[PDB]
């Protein structure tokens, strides 16, 4: 039998290939094709800002954070052009409510990231990864860390659990009218999304490239693997939250939390 | 290379069409093997339950919806044939109007029977409905010498 | 190596195209779209003017210009909401009373 | 540098021409997103590093999403197509096209009279706008926050909900 | 520079009003009450008038590079505050009959007061933009307040698209000037190449929409018919009073406004504003469109003074006193219009044919409209005549013969419609805050009469304020 | 560099799509109430000032924290206003 956990995703990707494609009648064609890559290429190029090595850095640009926020904002268009391209009021309203909770829960990540980039004081990721040399930026900002976790798992990562189903009747999940390779494009997109959120968490909150007694790139890789396993553990443990409870614990609870977080870091930094 | 065949053997997506009865054992199986199964995304349809004359067009639309590689498992005596209900209101088997690949007798079958159905269907999917000149061998014929060599069984006055 | 004229004529072209889109169409959604386009054109002209002198004077009101764009688009979209809730026709000629 | 600037400027120009010629709205929104991404590329080429990435996060990531929401909920596709194309003929497009072209040629003639004094793509980092926003320009930020509160309340008001 | 206590005392008007918005917003979320919100909003604006004395204790100085605080700005902040005080007292009687959400009104007027008192204090081109838009967003939204009618929404939408269009012209002009000059500060500007002048013309377009000038005046009838009369009190008086201060300061400080190239263009706009106002104003039989037509001519008289700001120092006080007289005349007239709509009444039926009688219906209120309506024209014993007299003197001082002749012939043409409304209130007939609204317009009637017959004390205030 | 990686990504997209092709009116009460998204459209513009703020705070100091507290207090007042009026509540 297959001994590797990743081999299942490999077989899934192989399976999605070479599947006959049917044309949908009474549907738009340009957005039916373009909506997958707005979800895929966005988090693919979100991988372009990781400091995997000082000598093998994929991009030595001065700003990577703003690019990440630009991808976070862009991601909604995939669910929206998918909703309009569904051309079925059921699926359209399902993608409208999914994009609703998406835009609702995408607010927090920028303001939560302001704390760490303020105690870091720079946008070049070499400065952040060199800042966590002796003390990591996780001890004071517990609330910011959990807020960034919730925001990262809330962007169409299935934690809301309203993507393939709908609590409200008269409407249906928007993953029904896609049955070709686009469904595999969605899965691979959320896969690169979760691994990139984990990588950004380790290299921006914790200390990347430390190397206490072993080479630091495998130290980063193993820490990323442990946080991957913990993310999967809590994703599985996390039960489906109905739409209402998600709306209740959205703008009410974490906007004040991040605002007092900025107040605390600004008061203690000087 | 046959990499495509490995791809199709390794992973399959099940569409559960269990009906009123006979689905509690299927649930017993599914909660051990596994919200992922979704309409218009699956390539495997496990027809179970009594296929009624009234709702058969629904099964024909769901059969039409799936992709080019179509597999069908009939489970239960009520779905393989008419079963015990040889009556005006039941069609005598789902194989009358859709092709079927694997037949799983029982009433209801066991979760292990569902497991053995996945094993025989990956075995069929791994030889390229194609006989490939290998499916003439039958479970009636393959384990025949296994079953005939059984002599003694436990007496039924014990637990 | 680009002088000021190229960027300023680019901003002028977007300004003119946004103004024309604000004029010619009937749908209030499309006038709001042209309004936002032409706001962006004016903001682009400001940004190239600010970056001409080589100090931090282009990013200081561009942020507030896009703040104005956000607020104006939001109030306009709510006006479209209540307009379509009142009357199904979305043409500007529906609200064309008190002529002269 | 020059060829990249020319090709992205022409992409922006083509997208701007495309958004003002089509009838279906979603194509126009897509082409306007393309134009905004091109403008952010222009901002990054000029050296306004805190402008090209600032436009996308907000201008092309929230407001255009609001446009998509309102055009999606109206469901105006499939109704009222023929008469809009009938009225918007090329003949009535030429009318104000030359009137705006007078403005275009006047501003081109105004700008070509000055000297060039070309500036290179000087990079401006966020460290200095973090000071300039906080230098003379603090009350601008405060009055912008009050402006945004004003936008919030007028959008809540004129978008009033009811039983229907 | 940093924050010193001198800067906070100088900023006290922008501060008290901002603290009022916060307290009003908290009070709305707490109780959602009309009486408490009206009381809280009027107390903050009255507190801003009290604190004008405290900034008078401070001298002529800067707060930031964005703003310059002079004694000129002290008077303009006062004009805007009384208009905000005037509009809330006229809105309570109109909004008592409104069906629901009667509490957002004072919040938007308070935002507009912030915008008005920010264009009084100006020294940089950006403060000019933070002020224009802070006041427009309430004027975007308050002409659309009570959108249940078929014309309020119409008026709001026409003003919304056009005001965003003017702001886009102003912003594009604002940068095309800064391409030549190294700074956008008014003083630092101009340190006559065509791009700077071309950028200047674009700002004239973006400013002359809100000042209702001749090729941009098309909005002033329609929204004035569509908007509620409490909003028309603010839209006629406060916005253009606040806006005229910043456009005068730009030409006083900037050395480019000294050149005759911009001067000739603004004079022709002023010439045509008087003519294209006072000829189309005759045929109207609607009082709100009638006042909106007169607004175009009044802003034209302000421009014929402003063109001769650079010749003689009497133009400073001339613009100031005509603005004071113009405030009092329009507040009294628009208050009587709003005071006739003592309930909400859905669409108010106001017209020149609807104002037959009105002396045997309500005699005191007819007297106020007549006194103010004669004050708009140029009849003596009224403050409008002294304001008219200084703009004639300024035009004589600067030898602008065509422009001063335009004012006289514009006055000659415009006497006609003011007099019909004055006599139409004498043909044959066809709560506590309401008494407070009557007190405001009656107080203004006494003021315009005593400052027309006896105008010296107002001049002493104006020369006290001018630097 | 970044351009090479972008070319690689778009080439992979072209390769997968080309390979895939070769291999072979009235809503009434429904929807509406997107005003949470309008609240986001305005709040992203508010938070863009904090995005620009986060770069330079050590040289800002005490008046900076003071007026940032005033800013977020105004935002909090607006938020509790929206809550208490019933705008921010359960939504379809
Ligand atoms: S096979 Fe047995 S359990 Fe299943 S549907 Fe038929 S009768 Fe019911």
PDB file of C-alpha atoms in Angstrom, chain B residues 15-21 23 26 46-49:
ATOM      1  CA  UNK B  15     -21.301   9.062  -5.382  1.00  0.00           C
ATOM      2  CA  UNK B  16     -23.559   7.595  -2.692  1.00  0.00           C
ATOM      3  CA  UNK B  17     -27.075   6.940  -4.023  1.00  0.00           C
ATOM      4  CA  UNK B  18     -28.307   4.796  -1.135  1.00  0.00           C
ATOM      5  CA  UNK B  19     -32.089   4.856  -0.770  1.00  0.00           C
ATOM      6  CA  UNK B  20     -34.600   4.550   2.118  1.00  0.00           C
ATOM      7  CA  UNK B  21     -33.387   1.190   3.464  1.00  0.00           C
ATOM      8  CA  UNK B  23     -28.100   2.589   3.511  1.00  0.00           C
ATOM      9  CA  UNK B  26     -23.410   1.721   3.756  1.00  0.00           C
ATOM     10  CA  UNK B  46     -22.905   3.119  -6.083  1.00  0.00           C
ATOM     11  CA  UNK B  47     -26.542   2.404  -6.890  1.00  0.00           C
ATOM     12  CA  UNK B  48     -28.143   0.803  -3.834  1.00  0.00           C
ATOM     13  CA  UNK B  49     -31.732   0.249  -2.785  1.00  0.00           C
TER      14      UNK B  49
END
